[PDB]
Design a protein around this motif. Structure first.
Motif, PDB file in Angstrom:
ATOM      1  N   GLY D 119       2.501  -3.257  -5.684  1.00  8.39           N
ATOM      2  CA  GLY D 119       3.714  -4.015  -5.425  1.00  8.39           C
ATOM      3  C   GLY D 119       4.380  -3.641  -4.114  1.00  8.39           C
ATOM      4  N   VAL D 120       4.472  -2.340  -3.823  1.00  8.60           N
ATOM      5  CA  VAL D 120       5.086  -1.945  -2.557  1.00  8.60           C
ATOM      6  C   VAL D 120       4.189  -2.348  -1.396  1.00  8.60           C
ATOM      7  CG1 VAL D 120       4.206   0.328  -2.979  1.00  8.60           C
ATOM      8  CG2 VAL D 120       5.829   0.015  -1.125  1.00  8.60           C
ATOM      9  N   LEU D 121       2.865  -2.313  -1.584  1.00  8.64           N
ATOM     10  CA  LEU D 121       1.957  -2.831  -0.566  1.00  8.64           C
ATOM     11  C   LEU D 121       2.269  -4.287  -0.260  1.00  8.64           C
ATOM     12  CD1 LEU D 121       0.382  -0.219  -0.638  1.00  8.64           C
ATOM     13  CD2 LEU D 121      -1.659  -1.491  -1.293  1.00  8.64           C
ATOM     14  N   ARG D 122       2.388  -5.102  -1.311  1.00 10.57           N
ATOM     15  CA  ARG D 122       2.728  -6.508  -1.137  1.00 10.57           C
ATOM     16  C   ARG D 122       4.042  -6.661  -0.388  1.00 10.57           C
ATOM     17  NH1 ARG D 122       1.371  -7.120  -6.058  1.00 10.57           N
ATOM     18  NH2 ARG D 122      -0.605  -8.083  -6.694  1.00 10.57           N
ATOM     19  N   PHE D 123       5.065  -5.907  -0.797  1.00  7.66           N
ATOM     20  CA  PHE D 123       6.373  -6.033  -0.159  1.00  7.66           C
ATOM     21  C   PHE D 123       6.311  -5.643   1.312  1.00  7.66           C
ATOM     22  CE2 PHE D 123      10.730  -4.048   0.535  1.00  7.66           C
ATOM     23  CZ  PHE D 123      11.300  -5.251   0.895  1.00  7.66           C
ATOM     24  N   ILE D 124       5.584  -4.570   1.626  1.00  5.92           N
ATOM     25  CA  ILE D 124       5.506  -4.088   2.999  1.00  5.92           C
ATOM     26  C   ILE D 124       4.797  -5.101   3.889  1.00  5.92           C
ATOM     27  CG2 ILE D 124       4.451  -2.320   4.450  1.00  5.92           C
ATOM     28  CD1 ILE D 124       6.781  -1.136   3.409  1.00  5.92           C
ATOM     29  N   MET D 125       3.701  -5.695   3.403  1.00  4.34           N
ATOM     30  CA  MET D 125       3.069  -6.747   4.197  1.00  4.34           C
ATOM     31  C   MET D 125       3.921  -8.010   4.266  1.00  4.34           C
ATOM     32  SD  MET D 125       0.608  -4.708   4.532  1.00  4.34           S
ATOM     33  CE  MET D 125      -1.167  -4.522   4.445  1.00  4.34           C
ATOM     34  N   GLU D 126       4.725  -8.287   3.236  1.00  3.59           N
ATOM     35  CA  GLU D 126       5.645  -9.416   3.321  1.00  3.59           C
ATOM     36  C   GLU D 126       6.706  -9.186   4.388  1.00  3.59           C
ATOM     37  OE1 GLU D 126       6.345  -9.231  -0.792  1.00  3.59           O
ATOM     38  OE2 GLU D 126       4.336 -10.069  -1.064  1.00  3.59           O
ATOM     39  N   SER D 127       7.135  -7.935   4.569  1.00  5.01           N
ATOM     40  CA  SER D 127       8.045  -7.622   5.666  1.00  5.01           C
ATOM     41  C   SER D 127       7.380  -7.866   7.016  1.00  5.01           C
ATOM     42  CB  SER D 127       8.526  -6.176   5.556  1.00  5.01           C
ATOM     43  OG  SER D 127       9.728  -5.988   6.280  1.00  5.01           O
ATOM     44  N   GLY D 128       6.069  -7.655   7.097  1.00  4.39           N
ATOM     45  CA  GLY D 128       5.337  -7.923   8.318  1.00  4.39           C
ATOM     46  C   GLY D 128       4.796  -6.681   8.994  1.00  4.39           C
ATOM     47  N   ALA D 129       4.483  -5.656   8.210  1.00  6.43           N
ATOM     48  CA  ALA D 129       3.930  -4.429   8.761  1.00  6.43           C
ATOM     49  C   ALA D 129       2.426  -4.562   8.961  1.00  6.43           C
ATOM     50  CB  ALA D 129       4.234  -3.246   7.847  1.00  6.43           C
ATOM     51  N   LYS D 130       1.945  -4.057  10.098  1.00  8.53           N
ATOM     52  CA  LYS D 130       0.534  -4.162  10.440  1.00  8.53           C
ATOM     53  C   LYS D 130      -0.360  -3.328   9.535  1.00  8.53           C
ATOM     54  CE  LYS D 130       0.727  -2.635  14.564  1.00  8.53           C
ATOM     55  NZ  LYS D 130       0.849  -2.320  16.012  1.00  8.53           N
ATOM     56  N   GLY D 131       0.202  -2.438   8.731  1.00  6.28           N
ATOM     57  CA  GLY D 131      -0.604  -1.687   7.793  1.00  6.28           C
ATOM     58  C   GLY D 131       0.244  -0.704   7.020  1.00  6.28           C
ATOM     59  N   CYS D 132      -0.306  -0.270   5.891  1.00  5.15           N
ATOM     60  CA  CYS D 132       0.386   0.672   5.028  1.00  5.15           C
ATOM     61  C   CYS D 132      -0.623   1.489   4.239  1.00  5.15           C
ATOM     62  CB  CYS D 132       1.345  -0.044   4.069  1.00  5.15           C
ATOM     63  SG  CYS D 132       0.569  -1.266   2.987  1.00  5.15           S
ATOM     64  N   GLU D 133      -0.249   2.734   3.960  1.00  2.49           N
ATOM     65  CA  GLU D 133      -1.010   3.632   3.108  1.00  2.49           C
ATOM     66  C   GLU D 133      -0.053   4.317   2.146  1.00  2.49           C
ATOM     67  OE1 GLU D 133      -2.563   5.980   6.501  1.00  2.49           O
ATOM     68  OE2 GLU D 133      -4.523   5.138   5.989  1.00  2.49           O
ATOM     69  N   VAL D 134      -0.494   4.493   0.905  1.00  4.03           N
ATOM     70  CA  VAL D 134       0.279   5.189  -0.118  1.00  4.03           C
ATOM     71  C   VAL D 134      -0.652   6.205  -0.764  1.00  4.03           C
ATOM     72  CG1 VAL D 134       1.778   5.009  -2.107  1.00  4.03           C
ATOM     73  CG2 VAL D 134       1.646   3.128  -0.494  1.00  4.03           C
ATOM     74  N   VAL D 135      -0.582   7.449  -0.307  1.00  5.57           N
ATOM     75  CA  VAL D 135      -1.369   8.530  -0.885  1.00  5.57           C
ATOM     76  C   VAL D 135      -0.558   9.133  -2.026  1.00  5.57           C
ATOM     77  CG1 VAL D 135      -2.754  10.563  -0.398  1.00  5.57           C
ATOM     78  CG2 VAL D 135      -2.238   8.925   1.433  1.00  5.57           C
ATOM     79  N   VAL D 136      -0.976   8.864  -3.256  1.00  3.11           N
ATOM     80  CA  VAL D 136      -0.351   9.420  -4.447  1.00  3.11           C
ATOM     81  C   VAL D 136      -1.311  10.443  -5.030  1.00  3.11           C
ATOM     82  CG1 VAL D 136       0.555   8.954  -6.745  1.00  3.11           C
ATOM     83  CG2 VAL D 136       0.943   7.322  -4.884  1.00  3.11           C
ATOM     84  N   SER D 137      -0.842  11.673  -5.190  1.00  3.78           N
ATOM     85  CA  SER D 137      -1.670  12.750  -5.709  1.00  3.78           C
ATOM     86  C   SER D 137      -1.015  13.351  -6.943  1.00  3.78           C
ATOM     87  CB  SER D 137      -1.896  13.831  -4.650  1.00  3.78           C
ATOM     88  OG  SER D 137      -2.863  14.771  -5.083  1.00  3.78           O
ATOM     89  N   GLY D 138      -1.836  13.773  -7.891  1.00  3.62           N
ATOM     90  CA  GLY D 138      -1.343  14.375  -9.109  1.00  3.62           C
ATOM     91  C   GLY D 138      -2.297  14.108 -10.255  1.00  3.62           C
ATOM     92  N   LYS D 139      -1.850  14.485 -11.453  1.00  6.72           N
ATOM     93  CA  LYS D 139      -2.642  14.307 -12.670  1.00  6.72           C
ATOM     94  C   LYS D 139      -2.425  12.894 -13.209  1.00  6.72           C
ATOM     95  CE  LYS D 139      -0.130  17.928 -13.491  1.00  6.72           C
ATOM     96  NZ  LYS D 139       0.697  16.696 -13.577  1.00  6.72           N
ATOM     97  N   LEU D 140      -2.990  11.932 -12.477  1.00  8.90           N
ATOM     98  CA  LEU D 140      -2.855  10.533 -12.868  1.00  8.90           C
ATOM     99  C   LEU D 140      -3.514  10.260 -14.212  1.00  8.90           C
ATOM    100  CD1 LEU D 140      -2.912   8.312  -9.723  1.00  8.90           C
ATOM    101  CD2 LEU D 140      -1.446  10.243 -10.338  1.00  8.90           C
ATOM    102  N   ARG D 141      -4.559  11.011 -14.552  1.00  9.68           N
ATOM    103  CA  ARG D 141      -5.207  10.876 -15.847  1.00  9.68           C
ATOM    104  C   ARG D 141      -5.772  12.230 -16.255  1.00  9.68           C
ATOM    105  NH1 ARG D 141      -4.580   9.618 -19.964  1.00  9.68           N
ATOM    106  NH2 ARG D 141      -5.622   8.127 -21.352  1.00  9.68           N
ATOM    107  N   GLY D 142      -5.582  12.583 -17.526  1.00 11.15           N
ATOM    108  CA  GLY D 142      -6.056  13.861 -18.018  1.00 11.15           C
ATOM    109  C   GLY D 142      -5.296  15.021 -17.397  1.00 11.15           C
ATOM    110  N   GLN D 143      -5.997  16.144 -17.240  1.00 11.79           N
ATOM    111  CA  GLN D 143      -5.431  17.321 -16.599  1.00 11.79           C
ATOM    112  C   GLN D 143      -6.105  17.670 -15.281  1.00 11.79           C
ATOM    113  OE1 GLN D 143      -2.680  19.147 -16.721  1.00 11.79           O
ATOM    114  NE2 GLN D 143      -2.179  17.517 -18.177  1.00 11.79           N
ATOM    115  N   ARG D 144      -7.234  17.046 -14.961  1.00  9.80           N
ATOM    116  CA  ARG D 144      -7.882  17.228 -13.665  1.00  9.80           C
ATOM    117  C   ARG D 144      -7.139  16.377 -12.645  1.00  9.80           C
ATOM    118  NH1 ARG D 144     -11.057  19.166 -10.756  1.00  9.80           N
ATOM    119  NH2 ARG D 144     -12.880  20.487 -11.162  1.00  9.80           N
TER     120      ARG D 144
END
Lengths: 144, 67, 55, 225, 97, 138, 101
Positions: D119-144
């Motif tokens: 969703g934030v990717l969509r919003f950022i390109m709707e604003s007109g940004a030439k590119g975006c990255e969202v590095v999310v790190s953590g225990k997204l699943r399990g404990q690894r």
RNA sequence: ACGAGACUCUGGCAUGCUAACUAGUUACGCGACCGGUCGGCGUAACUUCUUAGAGGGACAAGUGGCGUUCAGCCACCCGAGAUUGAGCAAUAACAGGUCUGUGAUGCCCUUAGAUGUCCGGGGCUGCACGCGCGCUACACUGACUGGCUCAGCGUGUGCCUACCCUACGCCGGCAGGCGCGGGUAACCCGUUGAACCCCAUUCGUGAUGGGGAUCGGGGAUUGCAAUUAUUC
């Protein structure tokens, strides 16, 4: 004619000033000539035995090259390498008392003396005599 | 190394292709015309483009140009 | 209230007198230009203070 | 006060850092974007850029007053000289902290990490940004624990153009199983004499004006305008 | 241990005037220069902080070795009721927000 | 009044204040030959006999030099003197003599009036010098 | 006093240049004799720290640099005119101080 | 398309420009012999040395050789410079380190040790030991008053605290104390007078004036006590 201080080879020039200081005797006779170690960094014996006279001549040379020099500064021209033993070497200031006594020997004797407001004043007698010593050194055996 | 980059080479190619008439055999005139006709934000990049422009013009002076 | 047992040895000449102005850290403190910063916090707020990595 | 200017400037920087951290731990829940500090004779004004000006202003104009007091005890500034102005941001989708906090609250508001990032990717390109990255790190699943990236558009990573063509926001996100990390990097577009991009282009970009289409004359003529 | 009532009243009035008071947890300083002249040690700040934390009438925020209280409407009401102050006492200045 | 010519080597820099005279050369209270090293003396004497004493007989140039080290203070006095002479001749008398002396100085030493661009290189952490690195065990 | 000193301290060269140009423009609006903007040497606050928050790794050092730029202008004007001149146009980032010369 | 390059800061050249009693070059009242040393001054030629502000400058640009007769490489008149040095630095990863940075963190500590207050004293300064970085020495290219000549980065007057750099004279061969203070700094230290090059006198192949626990005694800081005492 006229010849100044700086256009004379400083080696025999300071030798001549030392000899003139020995011949004059108008100064306060040094009371330590070999009982001291001179510079703090130096833990080795002095040799010339004339270090009071030669150091007075050196002081006069240094106030003629740079007017206004005194103790605290004289230490900064007489500082040197200090071997700290097992550690590497550094720079060490000299003896402020020795330079101070040299200045007090010079002070009020009518060639050079340091004030209490800043700077050095040079009397006509001292500058005339020193310029004549420089000219005699130059034209005697250094210039024909 | 003094190998020109595809950015400098491509820009000089476009400059020769589109603005041949003004471009000459002198490097300095090439630099001035490249500054006037295109937005080149770096003086060093301007000069690299102008040098490749000059070399390309000498190449056409030899005759055909392959690129 | 703890004034008759503490203050038994004045603390104004050691590393206990200087602490990080953010995390109360007494290790790796920077005292240049009155920063009173630790390395981690200084690099955390390096761009805000005014220093920029350019050399 | 009389003060050497080096110490003056480093203490001023420490002052700005203190403001920024206090408001980031303080004003974040109100769509915080940034702070601009103006120095006028014997006073400092604090203009606050934030997407939620109504939240920070608050009912009865309460909170925006109280803040001026709460800093006054810490900074020790003279009375009356300190005042702040709460403004709505002029950089909605191009201020990295804005959408970083947005993502923080998406993850806090029971929205999936991948869905929120999309969703934030969509919003950022709707604003007109030439590119975006969202590095999310953590225990997204399990404990690894693991990282997770959403790169779209294009993006420069090296050189000076990174400082002014890239807006970077690193934030810590709360999670039940631990603390997640979010890195929202937006490559700002380029517009000249505008308000959404740097006034200078990418130094590796060369733009060429299309030459005029004038017909070449074939016979000299005298033109009377 | 015997936390004074007079010091409590002074602290409450100081908080009510503006909305914040100079709070530190350092013990190496007995009394802050603003906190001096009124017998206000570090433990007084600690006790007030924890009592208002359990009470919840002000919300606490800690940042850079400093504390900040959010004086709420419930805080004003309880402060009036327990200090028995007049009802027209409220920080309500409007100039230069 | 100077010919406004300067002269450098390393961080040192020297300028020859110039006036009409009879070729008396002085360096900060001393003439050109009483400089202390007495082994670098030939380096200071290089111009005055490289082109002859006659050319240094109708112009008074005082060379003031500020910089670090003894030898780095040299290569500044001499270059400043030579380039001051060449500039004085170029702007006052003619070019033919100036061109002759410039060719002579360049042939003897091409870096007689151009500065030496080299400067001490910065030091990078993890090593004492610019290119030396700290020793480590494998 | 007749001799007034305007001190401009700025970390950013662009804002300092714009402020100096604006001040000279203001002193050109009203005929006032001005000395050119004296540029003092910049102050490079080079401070070096360890990159890692621990001891592990190679010897990596961040070399943070803050540059401070100094401008001085000296004028012959009454205090009212100097005060009017100073606060005519400014841009955040530059610190302006008025001193007695 | 990212990375490389480009980029930025730096190192070098402009006697071109905006200009500077917080910088000097020019302004002279012993002209000390009848054309001269100055920072011994004998108390309004303006930015050239100094200061980084805006432009410029270098691009393999010219010549020659080699080479798909390309991309390029090598050699040279010329030129300040014909490769300055750094900063940043992709995709992916490592069970690399960091819970010794914090309500930024998911588990134990709850029954008077829950640290949120505290320590009088010792610990990593002491050991049969093996290891890793570096210094002082490896000689008469070295030394035994050092006598005369210089710069460079840059730090410094503080509200958590006398807690600075210190110029000058007094006290002593000495660590240190006194005063007036100069400096909030291109205003003072500072023209930052060390390393060095010299010598028509003194070391001479030792275990030592090439050298250190030169064992032990004389020292001490407007600040908790210098104890295998990290200051001397």
């Amino acid at each position: 004619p006229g010849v100044t201080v700086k256009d004379v080879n400083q080696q025999e020039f300071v030798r001549a000033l030392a000899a003139f200081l020995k011949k004059s005797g108008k100064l306060k006779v040094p009371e330590w000539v070999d009982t001291v170690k001179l510079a703090k960094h130096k833990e080795l014996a002095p040799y010339d035995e004339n270090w009071f006279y030669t150091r007075a001549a050196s002081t006069a040379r240094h106030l003629y090259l740079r007017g206004g020099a005194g103790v605290g500064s004289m230490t900064k021209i007489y500082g040197g390498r200090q071997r700290n033993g097992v550690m590497p070497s550094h720079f060490s200031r000299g003896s402020k008392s020795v330079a101070r006594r040299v200045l007090q020997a010079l002070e009020g004797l009518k060639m050079v003396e340091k004030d209490q407001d800043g700077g050095r004043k040079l009397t006509p007698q001292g500058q005339r005599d020193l310029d004549r010593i420089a000219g005699q050194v130059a034209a005697a055996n250094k210039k024909h | 190394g003094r190998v020109r980059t595809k950015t400098v080479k491509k820009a000089a190619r476009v400059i020769i292709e589109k603005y041949y008439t003004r471009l000459g055999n002198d490097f300095h005139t090439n630099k001035r015309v490249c500054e006037e006709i295109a937005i080149i934000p770096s003086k060093k990049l301007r000069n690299k483009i102008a040098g490749y422009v000059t070399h390309l013009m000498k190449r056409i002076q030899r005759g055909p140009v392959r690129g | 209230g703890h004034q008759q047992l503490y203050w038994s040895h004045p603390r104004k000449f050691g590393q206990g007198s200087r602490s990080c102005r953010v995390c109360s850290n007494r290790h790796g403190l920077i005292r240049k230009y009155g920063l009173n910063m630790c390395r981690q916090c200084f690099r955390q707020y390096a761009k805000d203070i005014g220093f920029i990595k350019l050399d | 006060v009389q003060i050497s200017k080096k110490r003056k400037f480093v203490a001023d920087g420490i002052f700005k850092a203190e403001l920024n951290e206090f408001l980031t731990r303080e004003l974040a829940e109100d769509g915080y974007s940034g702070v601009e500090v103006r120095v006028t004779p014997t006073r400092t004004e604090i203009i606050i850029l934030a997407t939620r000006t109504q939240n920070v202003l608050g009912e009865k104009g309460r909170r925006i007053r109280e803040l001026t007091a709460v800093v006054q005890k810490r900074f020790g500034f003279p009375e009356g000289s300190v005042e702040l102005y709460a403004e709505k941001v002029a950089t909605r989708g191009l201020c990295a902290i804005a959408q970083a906090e947005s993502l923080r609250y998406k993850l806090l508001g029971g929205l999936a990490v991948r869905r929120a990032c999309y969703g934030v990717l969509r919003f950022i390109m709707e604003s007109g940004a030439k590119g975006c990255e969202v590095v999310v790190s953590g225990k997204l699943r399990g404990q690894r624990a693991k990282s997770m990236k959403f790169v779209d558009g294009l993006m420069i990573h090296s050189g000076d153009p990174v400082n002014y063509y890239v807006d970077t926001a690193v934030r810590h996100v709360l999670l039940r199983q631990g603390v997640l990390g979010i890195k929202v990097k937006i490559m700002l577009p380029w517009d000249p004499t505008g308000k959404i991009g740097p006034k200078k282009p990418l130094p590796d970009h060369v733009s060429i004006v299309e030459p005029k289409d004038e017909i070449l004359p074939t016979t000299p003529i005298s033109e009377q305008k | 241990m015997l936390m004074p009532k007079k010091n409590r009243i002074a602290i409450y009035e100081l908080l009510f005037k503006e909305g914040v008071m100079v709070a530190k947890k350092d013990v190496h300083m007995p009394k802050h220069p603003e906190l001096a002249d009124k017998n206000v040690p570090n433990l007084h700040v600690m006790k007030a902080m924890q009592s208002l934390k359990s009470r919840g009438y002000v919300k606490e925020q800690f940042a850079w070795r400093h504390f900040y209280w959010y004086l709420t409407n419930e805080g004003i009401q309880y402060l009036r009721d327990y200090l028995h102050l007049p009802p027209e006492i409220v920080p309500a200045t409007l100039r230069r927000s | 009044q100077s010919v406004q010519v300067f002269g450098r080597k390393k961080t040192a820099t020297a300028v020859a204040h110039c006036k009409r005279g009879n070729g008396l050369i002085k360096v900060n209270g001393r003439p050109l030959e009483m400089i202390e090293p007495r082994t670098l003396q030939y380096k200071l004497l290089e111009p005055v006999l490289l082109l002859g004493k006659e050319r240094f007989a109708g112009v008074d140039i005082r060379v003031r030099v500020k910089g670090g080290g003894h030898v780095a203070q040299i290569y500044a006095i001499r270059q400043s003197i030579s380039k001051a002479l060449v500039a004085y001749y170029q702007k006052y008398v003619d070019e033919a003599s100036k061109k002759e002396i410039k060719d002579i100085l360049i042939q003897y030493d091409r870096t007689l009036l151009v500065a030496d661009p080299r400067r001490c290189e910065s030091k990078k952490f993890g090593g004492p010098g610019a290119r030396a690195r700290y020793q480590k065990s494998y | 006093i007749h001799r007034i000193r305007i001190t401009l301290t700025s970390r950013n060269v662009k804002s300092l240049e714009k402020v100096c140009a604006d001040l000279i423009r203001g002193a050109k609006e009203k005929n006032l004799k001005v000395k050119g903007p004296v540029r003092m040497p910049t102050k490079t606050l080079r401070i070096t720290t360890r990159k890692t928050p621990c001891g592990e790794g190679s010897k990596t050092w961040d070399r943070f640099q803050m540059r401070i730029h100094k401008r001085l202008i000296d004028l012959h004007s009454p205090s009212e005119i100097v005060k009017q001149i100073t606060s005519i146009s400014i841009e955040p980032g530059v610190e302006v101080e008025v001193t007695i010369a």
